[PDB]
């Protein structure tokens, strides 16, 4: 009932030359098939839980306390020995190691944000090619994952598993207005500009380990789906947009039970209206308030659309 | 049967001037804070609308039952002008209930707010150095927080979630602190006294949620008082860990405010690394910032914990007397 | 002598505990600040080394005459332990001169520092509520700044730049600020106002006539940033300003008036008028919100000659406590 | 001998859509960049006005000759719609000159700008995976910078300051620094650097892009930096930025000088590889960072090209 946990945050862990992720399912929305993992880096945050931690608070008894500094060492050492190719697999690997090492712990939770790097083009004597030595630190969208593992009477189980992509920022330079809303006493065209966080859950949680890559859903593919649907669809709202992104993701990945969204509307204000469309148009940043949406799409929703004569859902062949 | 579904407006800055003052707070030994003049009553609010009838706005792109997010902003700002109370929680509940009264198709309204904090300042006048009633400093230090969610009931509405807190307390204690007795194994850093430096977020929950409205200020728990308790306990107690510290901070808060059911904590250890050891304690010592990793704790203390301590012959819990 | 050339170490966090206290400051009408206990004497320092003999470290990758940057960090941190003074400027000049004495191939050393600021707090005790001598709050508000650059000379060393300042003062005045009379043409949309809730960010700096006054050996001649801050706040409180330009001119005059040992006070300002959402009273009961991102800014310096002119003019509007 | 005096407006976000494209850039071995479509031509601008006649606005609170800062914002945004050029430097000089022509009491106008950068992205279509012409990613990576200040002459106006640059390049190089001074203060990996690069034109009008073959695009400079970092075995960051500068001057003889501001953000080793970087683990260091500032000039390049002990090598044309 009581809240009780402790751990170490901002655990920067950068593994070089981890095993590559390869053999992904090819989809129309994306060219992403592999992730070379030359840098396999992340910002991890670990929390330990257990009833036996109580007196560390109530009595200042450090006897059963794994030092937070030691947890950091623990994570960093397991990054060196990990042989898999995915973030989710690594986190579950570390969680299970903690539990095997410390019998007095009841559960371990790991959250991680990718420390992202981009491949770049460099000029060489053989022309302009992709570098295998130099990479750009990306401050754009990044992969996320959360795994919590708890002890059971017969072993361990994953009690939470999350996968995602954060901070997708996209603008569409086409006309967008957004009408038909309630007009009352509280009531007071432009390139729709959105921030998107996307997460998903697996039917079979072992698929996230990447042991069979055809069943692993790479965040990069999801991002490409989102971008493609955004590009193609004539949306009626951000709500409407993310429903179709969700349907498409579920369509490409039947092994997922659910896809969820957290959005921001960051559309500019018009300052000088264009003379023909957006040709000659000038925009600026709006006042700080931003619209946001939260929504989950499920396989049952996809089945519903596919069986409805009135559905507008369309995906690439 | 429970899809995630909500939408709203964030970063809704609302700055109300000359709101009704909060006065008549319970006087406690840990604090001199008894009143908050509310000359500026400002916040960053975030509103979310929920309801089953919102489904087709996603699935069909039907905006017929959609309250525009810009309209939500207006709604909040206008209610900031009409609000006659003195607390953040009271304002949020007022707005939540107003939304529900206006839009019958909505099932629940959630308001989260971060105080846009200001400090009184001392200025020179012909009458000497006094507190200004015109000029205030924008504080980038600790700030008050609150969340209120109100949902429909069979006979009307109710608060289904209520949180109150103080965020971003950053305190250092320049006395020798060590922390010993932890597990030592193969994962223990090789190397074997520093000024404990902590970040603190503190929250609390009311037994009767109406106490947060401040209609009777004697039952209102001011975040400023809570902050002063934390600071005082940190000062007086010789702690064995951050875990141990926040337990005693929690007990003290519950002791001063029996109308609270729970006090919760989120902490960071941001203690410096030693570079030059002092030649007499911390005299002549030099420290620097550590590598990024930080220890953290999360914990809740409840009235049952306090009653147990007071009934225990071996308790080390001590509070200043009234 | 036209090339840009320097290297060094940034984000050198240096936290000295129990430094010698700053006490015996000049007492003034705008402030009660007379001493700074320096229980924590902390800063974020930035050091740059300059010199012609550093050229080949760039052009030839020759590290022979290179003080490695980690060594600069150690050097600074060790000197924080030995420094016996009470001011930021004194510490920086102390470090600069030490570097030049240690490394003869150096021509000049530059130190910039931003204070790592802490607040005294009130705690409850059995003897009542008092100021704690053990627990301090990390302040994310205004902080002290200083820059010292020292170059080698034929006879020793000289200070070639000395700066002192206070950064990130953020103050709001709810009423008592007007903006009217400006140019009205095809580009003006802004309504003229006799009253707006002025919200300002202020960076204030100053220069000493005698640069050694900054070492704090005679605290009565030392200008503490805390005093300058209190002056700015007081002038903001008292003056009915016509613009931020008008305001900072008077702040500067007032500062120079209290501290005749200063040659100039300079300003870097930012302005953020809230937007009115519900008009209030009048102005009590009003609701405001944050405006769009654009902000007005001002840069300006006031010198003793300006103050002398104001004091002798029959048309002067300058008034001090 | 002269007081500091200026005022203006900062955070002037200006987003022009479908500006005239930048095309016809000089082809170089280090880069594939030949064009910038300018579908979005966006920036964060900062304008400062100067003039003797501004004195009484400070000293007397006299607003008679004061162009309100809000009006400056409008002035800039309105000039964004009519600007017919293709470069950031050209737009800024255009606005500077417009201000001076409009307000005779002004002596000089200074504009600084940070690009509000967007990336082309790949989307799935019925025609396959292609670059979208509608949807763009907001980049939080490196961005173009420029500063133009224009002052009056007896016969018109002149550019008194002109700067062009690229800010916040963040590159890591995966491959394996010695010889520095060893004394009592000396205690002392994949080199990780932050780079700001700027340059100056021999003929400042080249920055207008009226003759694109003479315009130096920040994208090309960035690709040069990346290419040199990739190929060169550096002995220090000082040594590295010297060669980046030489190569830039080599590709762009119309530049008089290139300047650098660098940060060393190299990780700390936690688990050593067995060996090379295979199995290696790194983490973030304590905050202190090495930095360098440096300018390279054409005279340096001419010296290197004629020197027998020169180590300078560039890719062939």
UniProtKB/TrEMBL annotation, chain A:
<keyword id="KW-0560">Oxidoreductase</keyword>
<dbReference type="GO" id="GO:0006145">
    <property type="term" value="P:purine nucleobase catabolic process"/>
</dbReference>
<feature type="binding site">
    <location>
        <position position="239"/>
    </location>
    <ligand>
        <name>5-hydroxyisourate</name>
    </ligand>
</feature>
<feature type="binding site">
    <location>
        <position position="68"/>
    </location>
    <ligand>
        <name>5-hydroxyisourate</name>
    </ligand>
</feature>
<protein>
    <recommendedName>
        <fullName>factor independent urate hydroxylase</fullName>
        <ecNumber>1.7.3.3</ecNumber>
    </recommendedName>
</protein>
<dbReference type="GO" id="GO:0019628">
    <property type="term" value="P:urate catabolic process"/>
</dbReference>
<dbReference type="Pfam" id="PF01014">
    <property type="entry name" value="Uricase"/>
</dbReference>
<feature type="binding site">
    <location>
        <position position="265"/>
    </location>
    <ligand>
        <name>O2</name>
    </ligand>
</feature>
<comment type="pathway">
    <text>Purine metabolism; urate degradation; (S)-allantoin from urate: step 1/3.</text>
</comment>
<dbReference type="GO" id="GO:0004846">
    <property type="term" value="F:urate oxidase activity"/>
</dbReference>
<keyword id="KW-0659">Purine metabolism</keyword>
<feature type="binding site">
    <location>
        <position position="265"/>
    </location>
    <ligand>
        <name>5-hydroxyisourate</name>
    </ligand>
</feature>
<feature type="binding site">
    <location>
        <position position="265"/>
    </location>
    <ligand>
        <name>urate</name>
    </ligand>
</feature>
<comment type="similarity">
    <text>Belongs to the uricase family.</text>
</comment>
<feature type="binding site">
    <location>
        <position position="68"/>
    </location>
    <ligand>
        <name>O2</name>
    </ligand>
</feature>
<feature type="binding site">
    <location>
        <position position="239"/>
    </location>
    <ligand>
        <name>urate</name>
    </ligand>
</feature>
<feature type="binding site">
    <location>
        <position position="68"/>
    </location>
    <ligand>
        <name>urate</name>
    </ligand>
</feature>
<feature type="binding site">
    <location>
        <position position="178"/>
    </location>
    <ligand>
        <name>urate</name>
    </ligand>
</feature>
<feature type="binding site">
    <location>
        <position position="190"/>
    </location>
    <ligand>
        <name>5-hydroxyisourate</name>
    </ligand>
</feature>
<feature type="binding site">
    <location>
        <position position="69"/>
    </location>
    <ligand>
        <name>5-hydroxyisourate</name>
    </ligand>
</feature>
<feature type="binding site">
    <location>
        <position position="69"/>
    </location>
    <ligand>
        <name>urate</name>
    </ligand>
</feature>
<feature type="binding site">
    <location>
        <position position="190"/>
    </location>
    <ligand>
        <name>urate</name>
    </ligand>
</feature>
<dbReference type="InterPro" id="IPR002042">
    <property type="entry name" value="Uricase"/>
</dbReference>
